Amino acid sequence: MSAQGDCEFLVQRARELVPQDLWAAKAWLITARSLYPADFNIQYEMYTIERNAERTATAGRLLYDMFVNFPDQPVVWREISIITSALRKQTQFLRSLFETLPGRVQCEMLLKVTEQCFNTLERSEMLLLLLRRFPETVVQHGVGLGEALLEAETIEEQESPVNCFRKLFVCDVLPLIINNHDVRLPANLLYKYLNKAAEFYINYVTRIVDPWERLFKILNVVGMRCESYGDILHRMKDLCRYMNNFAHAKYKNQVVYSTMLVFFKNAFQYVNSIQPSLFVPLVLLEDVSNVYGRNRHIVVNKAELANSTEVLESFKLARESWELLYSLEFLDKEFTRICLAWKTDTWLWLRIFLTDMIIYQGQYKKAIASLHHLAALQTLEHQRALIQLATCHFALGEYRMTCEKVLDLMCYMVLPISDLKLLPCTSKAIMPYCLHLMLACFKLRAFTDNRDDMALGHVIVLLQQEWPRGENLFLKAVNKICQQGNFQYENFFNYVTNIDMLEEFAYLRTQEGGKIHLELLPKEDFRLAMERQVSRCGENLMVVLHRFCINEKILLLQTLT
Amino acid sequence: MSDIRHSLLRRDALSAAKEVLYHLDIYFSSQLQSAPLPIVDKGPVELLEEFVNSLQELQLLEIMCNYFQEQTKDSVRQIIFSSLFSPQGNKADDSRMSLLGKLVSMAVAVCRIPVLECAASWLQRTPVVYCVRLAKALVDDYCCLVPGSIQTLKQIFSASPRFCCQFITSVTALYDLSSDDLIPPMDLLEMIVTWIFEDPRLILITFLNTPIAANLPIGFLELTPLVGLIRWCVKAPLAYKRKKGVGMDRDSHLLYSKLHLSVLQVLMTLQLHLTEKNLYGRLGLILFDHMVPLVEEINRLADELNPLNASQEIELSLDRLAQALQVAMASGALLCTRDDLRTLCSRLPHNNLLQLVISG
Amino acid sequence: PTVVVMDVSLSMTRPVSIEGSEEYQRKHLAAHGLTMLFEHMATNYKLEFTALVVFSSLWELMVPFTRDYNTLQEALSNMDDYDKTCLESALVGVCNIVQQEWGGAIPCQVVLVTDGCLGIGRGSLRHSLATQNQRSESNRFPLPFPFPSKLYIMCMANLEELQSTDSLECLERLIDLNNGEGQIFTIDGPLCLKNVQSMFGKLIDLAYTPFHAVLKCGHLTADVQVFPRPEPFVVDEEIDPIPKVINTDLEIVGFIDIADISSPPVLSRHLVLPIALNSANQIAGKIPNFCVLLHGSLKVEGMVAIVQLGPEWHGMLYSQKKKSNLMMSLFEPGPEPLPWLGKMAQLGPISDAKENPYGEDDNKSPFPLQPKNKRSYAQNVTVWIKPSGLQTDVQKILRNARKLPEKTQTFYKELNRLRKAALAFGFLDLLKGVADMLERECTLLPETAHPDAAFQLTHAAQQLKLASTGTSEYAAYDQNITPLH
Amino acid sequence: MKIFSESHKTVFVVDHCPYMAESCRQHVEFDMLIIPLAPISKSLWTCSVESSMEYCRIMYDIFPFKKLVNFIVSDSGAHVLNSWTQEDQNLQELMAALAAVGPPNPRADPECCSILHGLVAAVETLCKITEYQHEARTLLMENAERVGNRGRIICITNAKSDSHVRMLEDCVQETIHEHNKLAANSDHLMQIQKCELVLIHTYPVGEDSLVSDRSKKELSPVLTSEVHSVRAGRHLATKLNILVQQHFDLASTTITNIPMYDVELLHHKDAHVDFLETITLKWCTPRTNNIELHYCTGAYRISPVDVNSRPSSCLTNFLLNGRSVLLEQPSKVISHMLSSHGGEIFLHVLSSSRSILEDPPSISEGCGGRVTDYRITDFGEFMRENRLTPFLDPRYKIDGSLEVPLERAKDQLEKHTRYWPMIISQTTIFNMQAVVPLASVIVKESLTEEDVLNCQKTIYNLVDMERKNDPLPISPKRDEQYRIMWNELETLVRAHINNSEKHQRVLECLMACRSKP
């Protein structure tokens, strides 16, 4: 008689006693175990009874017996897998069972499970419990799985650096290796690790508990290992004054990595400030103020932005960080290397900030090129490049392209109502900008000691806005008309809905104003139009100005003046 | 020596008993100081017989109790307790057993720990004929005379565990389940079940505390009552079937299964104790001579019970006996070869578990 | 006199989006309001001379001063539409026409109707105000009218809110150069015709309501209408700044002969016309009045009637082309407005006088009162500023010395005068010289050889000789020289 | 400005040191008709004193009241020649005081003194209060604070250098501050607010002007230095004439075309607003009695500048003879009319522009003009019976009550008009000549015993006429006329019963004598 049949009979007899008498079933299984100590079925069944009875003390000792004697049973691995899943009422019961076993056995079992895994995803999380549960295993495996995570993300070729692999690395794998002092790592490993961490951080902030704070802490830890956001900029500047003046690999690594980190932080703060959606958009423009006449200050109204001081300071700090970073040849070359290593398109907000920098820098040609780049990468809300390219054209004495861009700007304007200003994208602020710009361009065009009269008529039409701030301008215009005479404008009586203008132009017809032959229509009819035009007084001046501008796209032909 | 006896003749019975108790205490203390092993001469025994109504007996028991509580030295108290209640082979024994039983009962009532310890050490060093009588008297007056009095016996578990173990051994030796009149009461078995379940070591303390220097005399109380519990679980279905209340029978069967599990656990830890004490394979707490009578009792109960109608009880008893024997052999409690096991149970009724245990 | 300077510049032709009715230009609203004003002034203020100068680039007077309000009422609807607003020219022209027609003392209320769109420059109000104030020169700012004017401005431009966006300070300051005599008027609300009607009613009740008064001569009484309204008067700006007005009840306090009153300094001639409170002639005509009786009796008798206008004030109620009426003057407020009448509270009826001072035959007259201390031109002062006066005096004293001893008293009186002036001015050398001429004329005594005359001239010469020493012999001022017996 | 203007208080000073004793090198030719004497030149003191006296004469003639002036000759001592009381700012008193002072001593002690004492006295004297200032201050109890005591100080001297001029400038500023401090604590002394300073310097002709002319310079907000300089004689007199012309806002006149030379007058400026540096009004023919009550808007006094010359004498004697004189500004427009009101030659400023009160509504068309039986002549008698006359003796009414005579006139007017029917046909008692004595007597305040006899006779003749049934004026049976006339007489007398007990006596005399049915 084979012993297997006796074991089955003993198990079957004990199984039948389970619903009636657990103690009798346990007594049967105790005798069965004594007869056949090497039988797995007897031990597993009474192990199952303890698990069903939820007796951790007995069951916990039993799992060790099965593990150290019968590790090849698939049921043991299946049950162990359920326990690991619970680790990642029954869940608490299984968790308490895990704590009964000694730590030496627990770590040995976990390492065995790590080899059994097939997918790298489930494998990484399976072992991740062991490192936190057993911090002493960091030196043995912390670096290895970090590189394994590095290649696992690499072999999948994700379009974005945001994935399970990177998130596991930066949030969990990154802190544990750097914090441990026993685990010593080379400087190059530190550089690649911090590069990946910074990439994950910027991806997260642009698109978790504290991305920027974690990145700053990681940067500080890296700086300490190799040995506010404002004072550190000055401290690196002092180090430049102490090290950049004369391999100095540590100095170069610091002066590039810390600088780019603080630059990225300041740039993201500034971008979240202006146009927060891509992080009531704001647009750093150049509004000519005296249209009726390297350390510049950005003038911004506090009503549209109550945090102007801090964001201005952030922009300033990013400014010297960029200036210092591109200055040193070595530091600039390493920045170019790291930026080309990243996605060279550099998303959207980096381009926006670089455009703003170029606008403030003074090189408006590069500003126009970057505006073209941004437009290709893309008032409503998106047409910031419209006003930006308009002011860029206006800076470099274009006087044709700027008018073209301004006219195209109000093509998308629908609303019934120098120094670097800062205005929102709402009509109430952009419309005065366009009107001032066009008034300036046509004022320069007309006042040229030439025979042009269309330019003078146009500077008359645009002098209405913000009456009577153009008082001296209109005085000069009427004096010029009196000196010249024979003023001609076919569209005059379709745009001048102002009463001082009309009153003066009627006085120009009488003797004391001189018999100035005014050709303002396209003798009694000359008075007749005024009998009708005055009835248009009180209308929305913005509306009539906008209608005049959109209707007469031949302004560009007149801009030749 | 006669001066003490002459002095006590002028006092009343209670006063003479107290004075002779004090004199015996002083004499035994002096003897123990002079020599490590005192000798109990006939003088103190005669004085106790001569000097030591219901009210007078109650006052005498109370004086014994408070005197025993007053004494702090264990050896003198044990020696005096023995001299008071050791067998003497005279006609005055029945009075001495009666006094011992009354004193034990009243000490249990008022929790006299020194008296309980003295009684526990007494039960180990006398023949079982008086231990079974004391056990029967305690079971009676704590279960059948006054209902609800067995709770007072339950608190002794936390007070005098040695006394509880001695009482368990005595009741196991007394109640062999050989007759319906020997069927143990429900309250006593319930209390024993709770006592053993609360502490498996309650019956193993007696094996550990005393130094094992010689084999116990034949006819005395066993060191560990595991033999009695094994006999109880083996003969429980047979005696109950012979007696044949369904709920009471079910509760009794459940309690017997619980105590069988407790006995298995006790043997399992006794294996480790024997390994620690280096007595594994050398000292056997379960004598082979005590298993033949219970095997014959099981066989005669099987023959008398007409197994054609009571097959379940016979099978369960055989399975319990096989399990107990296998656990004892594995745990080293029983030191015998498998040939003796095969020969002894060859006449026993056929059982699959028993045959597997025999074959191993 | 009122000049209704109404703006006609193109700024006033702006239509206003009034709710409900059709579109009215501000010119039409001004026309309606001024039509109400002219109707009221032609019904209850008929005696008022009014004129309507329009201004824009140039000011032109369509109708001069006239009482024919039917002429003006049509001028408001036959208007041109000249452009360019220019206020300074308008004010200069108004000053010119007022000074040409009336003069410089009669008041001229100026109901000016602007639009709150002052101008753009050059002729605009802002440019003139900002510059001419610190420039003046020949083209001085005309806003301080050179006569007791009162500048009202119907700035009919919505509420103050509409005109406060650009310019209201210019106008309200423009009032202030008239020494504060004026008031800005704004049409609060959505420029409804009812609102402009209310504003013009406010102007009417402020300026163009007649000054009804009850004339009482003892117990006889009548109700009159003193045109023009009496201008408040101020005694000074240091001892009594609060202006005083005339009491409503003019209590007549006597009568003074016209020749006695001479031509008194009046403040303002005021007509008095009885008022009833062809019906005007068929009911009020046939009821006997007082004013008619007083005027008739004054014209026939030829006297005046002093009037107690109030505390410390006083007037006069006289009679009268061939037409006549009862025009009443107003004297200067003060104790004795007429110096040749005594303190006017010291005039009492002839009954309380001892005799009849005016005479039984009406010949004597206590008036006028001679001054207490006689002036110079009536007394005999001795001016020696030019040499002509001193030469005349010495020639007179020499000539009368020839007529001695006939006019001895006159010669000695004039010599005493000369001596008094001599010690008064310390011209002691002059006295020595005049003594030398006295001796000279003694040497040229005629052949008549009058005995007394020689003695008098010798005595006088000795007196001048001793007085020319300067010692206290005759140097006393009262020591007049006496001729010898 | 107000009564207490900066011209209210003028304190002349004159240099009196022996330096002010030589001649002014302007010897005169008072010898007209053998060998005449050497021409005599007036001493510089004489020139200054006489020209200042002429200034004072013009001041007095033009402003008889409310403008007082002191005189402080500055010698070894500091004498003030007259106080501020109006009864002491008289010309002849000034003449007497200056005569008592006497000519400056030639050789007493030349350098012993300077004019600083005169200036310090002038500021000290300027601190006092005029009688009119006292009246104003007591009038404004608890409010006599806004009474500006601003004056003006005029000084004449011969300063040797501009250094001395600056010296007394500092001296006068310091003493002004000291006097202001002294008057701050005291009560019977005002604090000077503005004291315009004039320091006319004179020298004999032919000598260099050691001090150049200077313009205004305010050394303090309580001073105005305007030191001029001019030679003695006619130049000094013309300078002081200009000063008086430009101080009190005076103006000139050049009345010409006088039938017999030209004449010039000084009078207050405001008379020239009609024309708007001597205007050239021409005499016009004085009509005897063409019109009587002209329209005069200002009665300004006049004062000749050559008072004893032939043209001024002739013109002013003609004026004071009584007749007026009508001038005419240069088709002709009648204008300013001279006249003589008791010996104070006024210059009325008539009005020749169009009168805004022209073409008045006819009194025959206004209310009350359509009734043609008015008692115009009877009211004329009523008017001539209430004529006015001044009272220079203020009588007492009852007890400590000095009656104001105009209140008497108003009460008399109220008495006389208690029963004055308004048209002839309205009344019948008044039109009958019998009641005339009673009509003219009963209205008096207290009818005398002779008046009692007259009224008794009047009622007796009234009863006689009633008995005779004589035809009374129509003004309706014969007895009805008598009845209504008795009723009118009773109504008249009953109204004046409270006038006196004699009125009540004649009242019950009427009651007894009346023919009441």
PDB file of N, CA and C in Angstrom, chain D residues 323-341:
ATOM      1  N   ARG D 323     -25.395 181.578  -8.515  1.00  0.00           N
ATOM      2  CA  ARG D 323     -25.772 180.961  -9.777  1.00  0.00           C
ATOM      3  C   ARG D 323     -24.881 179.765 -10.091  1.00  0.00           C
ATOM      4  N   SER D 324     -25.463 178.782 -10.768  1.00  0.00           N
ATOM      5  CA  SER D 324     -24.728 177.602 -11.185  1.00  0.00           C
ATOM      6  C   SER D 324     -23.924 177.906 -12.444  1.00  0.00           C
ATOM      7  N   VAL D 325     -23.191 176.903 -12.920  1.00  0.00           N
ATOM      8  CA  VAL D 325     -22.424 177.005 -14.155  1.00  0.00           C
ATOM      9  C   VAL D 325     -22.426 175.643 -14.829  1.00  0.00           C
ATOM     10  N   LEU D 326     -22.898 175.583 -16.068  1.00  0.00           N
ATOM     11  CA  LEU D 326     -23.026 174.323 -16.791  1.00  0.00           C
ATOM     12  C   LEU D 326     -21.857 174.190 -17.756  1.00  0.00           C
ATOM     13  N   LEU D 327     -20.970 173.235 -17.491  1.00  0.00           N
ATOM     14  CA  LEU D 327     -19.883 172.957 -18.413  1.00  0.00           C
ATOM     15  C   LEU D 327     -20.382 172.071 -19.551  1.00  0.00           C
ATOM     16  N   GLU D 328     -19.473 171.701 -20.447  1.00  0.00           N
ATOM     17  CA  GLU D 328     -19.820 170.826 -21.561  1.00  0.00           C
ATOM     18  C   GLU D 328     -18.561 170.142 -22.066  1.00  0.00           C
ATOM     19  N   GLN D 329     -18.531 168.817 -21.970  1.00  0.00           N
ATOM     20  CA  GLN D 329     -17.389 168.065 -22.454  1.00  0.00           C
ATOM     21  C   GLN D 329     -17.287 168.183 -23.973  1.00  0.00           C
ATOM     22  N   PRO D 330     -16.065 168.270 -24.514  1.00  0.00           N
ATOM     23  CA  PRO D 330     -15.869 168.345 -25.965  1.00  0.00           C
ATOM     24  C   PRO D 330     -16.222 167.040 -26.672  1.00  0.00           C
ATOM     25  N   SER D 331     -23.865 168.165 -31.537  1.00  0.00           N
ATOM     26  CA  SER D 331     -22.594 167.502 -31.268  1.00  0.00           C
ATOM     27  C   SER D 331     -22.224 167.613 -29.793  1.00  0.00           C
ATOM     28  N   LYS D 332     -22.494 168.775 -29.206  1.00  0.00           N
ATOM     29  CA  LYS D 332     -22.182 168.990 -27.802  1.00  0.00           C
ATOM     30  C   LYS D 332     -23.121 168.184 -26.912  1.00  0.00           C
ATOM     31  N   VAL D 333     -22.609 167.785 -25.752  1.00  0.00           N
ATOM     32  CA  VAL D 333     -23.395 167.107 -24.730  1.00  0.00           C
ATOM     33  C   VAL D 333     -23.194 167.851 -23.418  1.00  0.00           C
ATOM     34  N   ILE D 334     -24.295 168.257 -22.786  1.00  0.00           N
ATOM     35  CA  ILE D 334     -24.197 168.920 -21.494  1.00  0.00           C
ATOM     36  C   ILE D 334     -23.694 167.924 -20.461  1.00  0.00           C
ATOM     37  N   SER D 335     -22.865 168.409 -19.546  1.00  0.00           N
ATOM     38  CA  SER D 335     -22.107 167.560 -18.641  1.00  0.00           C
ATOM     39  C   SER D 335     -21.909 168.284 -17.321  1.00  0.00           C
ATOM     40  N   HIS D 336     -20.841 167.931 -16.602  1.00  0.00           N
ATOM     41  CA  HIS D 336     -20.556 168.412 -15.255  1.00  0.00           C
ATOM     42  C   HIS D 336     -21.011 169.847 -15.025  1.00  0.00           C
ATOM     43  N   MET D 337     -21.761 170.073 -13.951  1.00  0.00           N
ATOM     44  CA  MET D 337     -22.351 171.372 -13.651  1.00  0.00           C
ATOM     45  C   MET D 337     -21.862 171.816 -12.281  1.00  0.00           C
ATOM     46  N   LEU D 338     -21.110 172.910 -12.244  1.00  0.00           N
ATOM     47  CA  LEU D 338     -20.687 173.471 -10.973  1.00  0.00           C
ATOM     48  C   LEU D 338     -21.871 174.116 -10.265  1.00  0.00           C
ATOM     49  N   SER D 339     -21.751 174.247  -8.952  1.00  0.00           N
ATOM     50  CA  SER D 339     -22.773 174.912  -8.160  1.00  0.00           C
ATOM     51  C   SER D 339     -22.171 175.230  -6.803  1.00  0.00           C
ATOM     52  N   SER D 340     -22.845 176.103  -6.068  1.00  0.00           N
ATOM     53  CA  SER D 340     -22.377 176.551  -4.763  1.00  0.00           C
ATOM     54  C   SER D 340     -23.483 176.315  -3.750  1.00  0.00           C
ATOM     55  N   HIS D 341     -23.313 175.298  -2.909  1.00  0.00           N
ATOM     56  CA  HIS D 341     -24.298 174.967  -1.885  1.00  0.00           C
ATOM     57  C   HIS D 341     -23.822 175.526  -0.547  1.00  0.00           C
TER      58      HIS D 341
END
